[PDB]
Amino acid sequence: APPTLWSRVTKFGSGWGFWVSPTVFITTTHVIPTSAKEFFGEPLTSIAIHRAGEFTLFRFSKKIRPDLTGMILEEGCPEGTVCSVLIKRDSGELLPLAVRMGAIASMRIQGRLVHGQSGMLLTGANAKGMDLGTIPGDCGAPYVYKRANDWVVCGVHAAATKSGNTVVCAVQ
Amino acid sequence: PTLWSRVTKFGSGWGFWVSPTVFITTTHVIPTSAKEFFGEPLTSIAIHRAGEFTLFRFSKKIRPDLTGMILEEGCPEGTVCSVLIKRDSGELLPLAVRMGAIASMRIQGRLVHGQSGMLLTGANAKGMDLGTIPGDCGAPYVYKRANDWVVCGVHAAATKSGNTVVCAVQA
Numbered sequence: 001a002p003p004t005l006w007s008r009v010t011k012f013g014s015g016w017g018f019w020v021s022p023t024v025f026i027t028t029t030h031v032i033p034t035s036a037k038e039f040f041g042e043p044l045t046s047i048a049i050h051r052a053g054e055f056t057l058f059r060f061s062k063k064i065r066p067d068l069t070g071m072i073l074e075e076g077c078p079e080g081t082v083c084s085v086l087i088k089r090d091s092g093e094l095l096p097l098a099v100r101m102g103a104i105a106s107m108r109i110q111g112r113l114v115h116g117q118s119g120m121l122l123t124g125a126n127a128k129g130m131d132l133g134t135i136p137g138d139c140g141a142p143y144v145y146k147r148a149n150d151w152v153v154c155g156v157h158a159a160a161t162k163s164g165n166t167v168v169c170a171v172q
Numbered sequence: 173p174t175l176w177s178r179v180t181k182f183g184s185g186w187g188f189w190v191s192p193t194v195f196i197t198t199t200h201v202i203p204t205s206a207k208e209f210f211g212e213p214l215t216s217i218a219i220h221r222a223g224e225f226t227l228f229r230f231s232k233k234i235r236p237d238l239t240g241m242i243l244e245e246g247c248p249e250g251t252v253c254s255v256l257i258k259r260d261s262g263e264l265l266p267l268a269v270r271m272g273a274i275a276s277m278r279i280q281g282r283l284v285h286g287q288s289g290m291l292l293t294g295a296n297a298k299g300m301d302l303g304t305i306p307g308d309c310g311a312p313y314v315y316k317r318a319n320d321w322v323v324c325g326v327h328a329a330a331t332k333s334g335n336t337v338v339c340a341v342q343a
């Protein structure tokens with residue numbers, strides 16, 4: 001995946017978030033520190049927060065990442081799209097995990113109620129665990145794909161089943 | 173302490189540490205001019221070649237941090253393996269592959285023998301991280317069976333813009 005997608009992937013709370021543009025940052029709601037009153041040097045009063053379940057978007061009143069171009073953010077993707085989930089792991093290792101996307105779904109995972117775009121990993125069978133699958137620390141990692149000549153971001157990693165074969169993308 | 177630490181840049185491709193003393197690779201990626209590998213003189217290394225599969229056995233522990241893994245001669249037809257690709261970008265690209273018959277195939281003009289497989293990442297990609305490249309040869313094929321990782325061969329060949337890969341196997 002292009003270097004300019006990896007540069008947008010930012011360590012954040014208990015997981016990750018993603019710079020769509022110089023002013024727009026997306027993440028998974030449950031990774032945000034609940035006590036936090038300041039983000040990237042800006043008070044809450046200077047930030048527009050848009051929350052839909054496990055999808056949160058932050059829009060800043062100043063350019064935080066002026067090195068970036070704005071890219072396309074969509075509300076999930078068509079069934080059958082293959083996405084990459086841009087996961088960072090122990091030691092500057094970069095894991096673009098392949099996933100086949102399916103329907104919008106409501107599920108119960110480890111007792112919690114989860115809603116978003118379902119998908120199934122294309123990394124292996126029985127993918128439970130860090131070598132072929134997701135871990136809790138991956139929440140907030142972006143789902144991206146290439147559409148003709150450009151890249152799209154279409155959500156953030158919210159959950160994975162106990163088996164690890166099914167994942168859920170939170171969507172705008 | 174990860175499978176991924178066993179995948180090593182070697183020659184014109186990669187290879188895999190099965191145990192502290194045993195390293196496997198694709199025959200065609202091995203240098204043809206060498207006096208040592210991994211700091212050990214070639215005089216002290218046992219080399220076992222079978223077609224596009226090569227196994228090195230060292231005289232001392234090169235990777236004492238590792239346990240020994242199960243190495244088998246390919247896998248049952250229909251097993252879904254992962255090919256553990258490392259890229260010079262720093263990316264790790266595990267790709268699911270449905271394994272088929274042992275066969276001889278003409279993969280871009282060359283006869284190659286080994287276990288055939290079909291990539292499970294779909295039609296092609298518009299340049300997504302979803303297929304192999306020539307630089308990937310020697311990457312291992314692995315799958316989880318009970319509580320054990322099994323390694324059953326190394327990446328030998330692929331059709332350009334196609335679905336078919338060849339896993340070279342022991343013996």
Ligand SMILES: O=C(NCCc1ccc(F)cc1)c1ccco1
Binds near residue numbers: 121124125126
């Ligand atoms: O696609 C996958 N499995 C299905 C293989 C298959 C069996 C039988 C078929 F008829 C057609 C495909 C997969 C990706 C990662 C783990 O599993």
